[PDB]
Design a protein around this ligand. Structure first.
Ligand code: HEM
Ligand code: HEM
Ligand SMILES: Cc1cc(N)nc(CCc2c(F)ccc(CCCN(C)C)c2F)c1
Ligand SMILES: Cc1cc(N)nc(CCc2c(F)ccc(CCCN(C)C)c2F)c1
Ligand SMILES: C[C@H](O)[C@H](O)[C@H]1CNc2nc(N)[nH]c(=O)c2N1
Ligand SMILES: C[C@H](O)[C@H](O)[C@H]1CNc2nc(N)[nH]c(=O)c2N1
Ligand SMILES: [Cl-]
Ligand SMILES: [Cl-]
Ligand SMILES: [Gd]
Ligand SMILES: [Gd]
Ligand SMILES: [Zn+2]
Lengths: 404, 402
């Protein structure tokens, strides 16, 4: 049982939940690989063992372990797999597992919200036109005129026998990335590849550096087809600064809804390759990572020139000063547009509260320090001084290969 | 079967073949990562020794020669007869540099080859120990043009106790418990401060009182030594454009000199071997002054800056912290005291990573300690995956002698 200390307060706890960790991560006694983004690389007897485990903690979470339907639900799954090789989740189990996956996500700092999650069951979907309509309900429900609500849509599980629902975009809302004669990009460089596949599947390329891409939706077997997102469904925030009047003229925008559409949800040994989930942004994601990373929009220098900062020397801290104001403008712009956003101080403080809750509830919490600490002002947030244990629990969101 | 390591800013990919030689085991398992934890006979002495002598005779491009094989035979002979062995001076200098080179949380290792090694292994008492330390501080400080240095006191040896420096650094500010239950000065130094007082030190009452040295000779109680004021170069803090900042009365010292770690070379242990470099500005501005459990000045500065501290989304913390760091850099440059900012320091560490990949096939690096505590992803080490493992020679933690 690892001893975990908070250096700001001096308090000590023990992570007993780590003992119950299963799918081993990347580290060994000889070397630590915690800083790697994708760890390592990406007879149905093993299906019954994960299904029974998952069914077990479901009845634990409603008191009703011991006698009653708990005994009985164990049989249906045993029979369902003996007869078919797989099994179907009861609607509430699918809800419980979807929330557990989010609760167990070590890299997510917003897990204080894990109990409030809207789970659309799209398991009877059997068409790429049908998915699109599901995806559009979600986006409309999640966005909710800017009062964001966390939501996930669960498309049908993978079944042995040829067939996989899949979204090809990494997110539901992505900005285009246009190569050109320099090789340099106009738009989002992280989306150069998918902008390529969008064009080579028919898409009409666009204007400039903030063009919402079309979706590439893939019903089982039959190849992907292009779908266009209606402009009124993609809510976007133009970026302005409360006191730097020229900032709006930079023409910067970002969208309202962060909706990850390329991870695999795994519940009780079942695999859902299309299960797009969505929440609301923390502002450093937009201001710091999306707009200021050198391999993203890389705007830092341009904002510094406008601020008349001494870009001739690193010791002026001109990068730090410009980055803060970008984050100021992001927070101001989403607020002025009445769009849910959370600053990194508010988020980390709520995560500490989530840590304390989980200590009482489950005796610990998996957390990946490197992703929990924000990308600016790290030691100014309370999570920086909190030691954390990282390990994999199920149900979980997992990374999955790409459909090409 | 070597870890594959990507840089995400640029797309580079390397493989850390050196991690395979990891000569000790850390806290992680496949079940759980513990990377974020701050604190993670004759036949084994012989194999550590044999591995160090091999390293030394590789570096002078003389591997497997007779000189090499003689030294190996010399060492195990000396281990049989005495239970231990003595390093030659050249082996000691190499071992001190390798320990710095091998330290995974050090962002300043581009400098590892430029280390001045003072051999104090003939030291005999606490009083001579004090003299060696003053020389070290004076040489390393160098009137503000700081030079990296280490002084090595005698090794742990059967029969006799250890030399120990009780202070965690050569220069520390006193931390006094208060009436408010609070602390006056640096809260990290409350313990050593109480130790000093009860060993005869007459305490001050300011926020920046330099502490005396508590120096332990073998099988002796610790002895109290005062540092001459003119040996401790200090820097008052001011801001280039916030002129009320100078009225805060803030100071920090020039020389960061860690004095409580154990230096390990070929199985030999040096419990007293203080080493010093120069500060990176975030250690002072962000951690020492802004940590809530340190001087905790962040809200004071922000209030004075007329920031809106009612709400966190004004980012008043980030703005105050940036300006405190600006003041640190400006102040040290004005005082003509060496200092590096986190951008220049992380850029030079990236170069170190590239030098090390060509030389040894990799580099032990602790990401959470290499990435600076402000502006993390604005520096290039943020997007560099790293591999953390323990090589020897090494600086190691040790328990406090009290
Ligand atoms: C409600 C507000 C939420 C906030 C503020 C938030 C914030 C974040 C942030 C900042 C990360 C860091 C990873 C990165 O930057 O790429 C993250 C990771 C993650 N989030 Fe959340 N999130 C929220 C909701 C959700 C929801 C609703 C789900 C799923 C149902 C979710 C699942 C995940 C997962 C699986 C990761 C792991 C990322 C990875 O492994 O690459 N989050 N979250
Ligand atoms: C000359 C410029 C130097 C710079 C800019 C520098 C910077 C740093 C920084 C910023 C850290 C992490 C700070 C912390 O623990 O909070 C660190 C750790 C460390 N440094 Fe360096 N350092 C320098 C010189 C040296 C020298 C001369 C030595 C020894 C010969 C050394 C050995 C170490 C060790 C062993 C650690 C690990 C501490 C631990 O495990 O907690 N450094 N350094
Ligand atoms: C639901 C949600 C809330 C929020 N605040 N932000 C996002 C986008 C960031 C993000 C995540 F959080 C989680 C996962 C991914 C994809 C994996 C990212 N890795 C592998 C580069 C992501 F890109 C999503
Ligand atoms: C030589 C030097 C240069 C520089 N730039 N900073 C320092 C002080 C920080 C620091 C180190 F670097 C190395 C070691 C310690 C002590 C270990 C503290 N561990 C538990 C966080 C330290 F506190 C020393
Ligand atoms: C809990 C956490 O690992 C701890 O507070 C670390 C994080 N990274 C750090 N990095 C540096 N350079 N110095 C520190 O003191 C710390 N503290
Ligand atoms: C190499 C390193 O692990 C990588 O750059 C990580 C670090 N921490 C991160 N943290 C968040 N929230 N998002 C990221 O993309 C990353 N990138
Ligand atoms: Cl994003
Ligand atoms: Cl320090
Ligand atoms: Gd101007
Ligand atoms: Gd002024
Ligand atoms: Zn690890």
């Amino acid at each position: 049982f690892p001893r975990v200390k908070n250096w700001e307060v001096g308090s000590i706890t023990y992570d007993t939940l780590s003992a119950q960790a299963q799918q081993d991560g990347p580290c060994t006694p000889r070397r630590c690989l915690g800083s790697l983004v994708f760890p390592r690389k990406l007879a149905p007897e093993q299906l019954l063992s994960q299904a029974r485990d998952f069914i077990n903690q479901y009845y634990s979470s409603i008191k009703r372990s011991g006698s009653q339907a708990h005994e009985q639900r164990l049989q249906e799954v045993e029979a369902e797999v003996a007869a078919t090789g797989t099994y179907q989740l009861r609607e509430s189990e699918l809800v419980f597992g979807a929330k557990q996956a989010w609760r167990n996500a070590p890299r997510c700092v917003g897990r204080i919200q894990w109990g409030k999650l809207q789970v659309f069951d799209a398991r009877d979907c059997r068409s790429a036109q049908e998915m699109f309509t599901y995806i559009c309900n979600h986006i409309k429900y999640a966005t909710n005129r800017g009062n964001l609500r966390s939501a996930i849509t669960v498309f049908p599980q993978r079944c042995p026998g040829r067939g996989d629902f899949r979204i090809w975009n990494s997110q539901l809302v992505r900005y285009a990335g246009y190569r050109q004669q320099d090789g340099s990009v106009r738009g989002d460089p992280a989306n150069v590849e998918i902008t390529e596949l969008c064009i080579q599947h028919g898409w009409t390329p666009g204007n400039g550096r903030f063009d919402v891409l079309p979706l590439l939706l893939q019903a089982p077997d039959e190849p992907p087809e292009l779908f266009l997102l209606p402009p009124e469904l993609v809510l976007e925030v133009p970026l302005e600064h409360p006191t730097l009047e020229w900032f709006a003229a930079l023409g910067l925008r970002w969208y309202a809804l962060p909706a990850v559409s390329n991870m695999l949800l795994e519940i009780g040994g079942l695999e859902f390759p299309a299960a797009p989930f969505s929440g609301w942004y923390m502002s450093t994601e937009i201001g710091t990572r999306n707009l200021c990373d050198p391999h993203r929009y890389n705007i830092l220098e341009d904002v510094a020139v406008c601020m008349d900062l001494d870009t001739r020397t690193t010791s002026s801290l001109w990068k730090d000063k410009a980055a803060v104001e970008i984050n100021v403008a992001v927070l101001h712009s989403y607020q002025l547009a009445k769009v849910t956003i959370v600053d990194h101080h508010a988020a980390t403080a709520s995560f500490m509260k989530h840590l304390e809750n989980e200590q009482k509830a489950r005796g610990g919490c998996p957390a990946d320090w490197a992703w929990i600490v924000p990308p600016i002002s790290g030691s100014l947030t309370p999570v920086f001084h909190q030691e954390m244990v990282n390990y994999f629990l199920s149900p979980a969101f997992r990374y999955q290969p790409d459909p090409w």
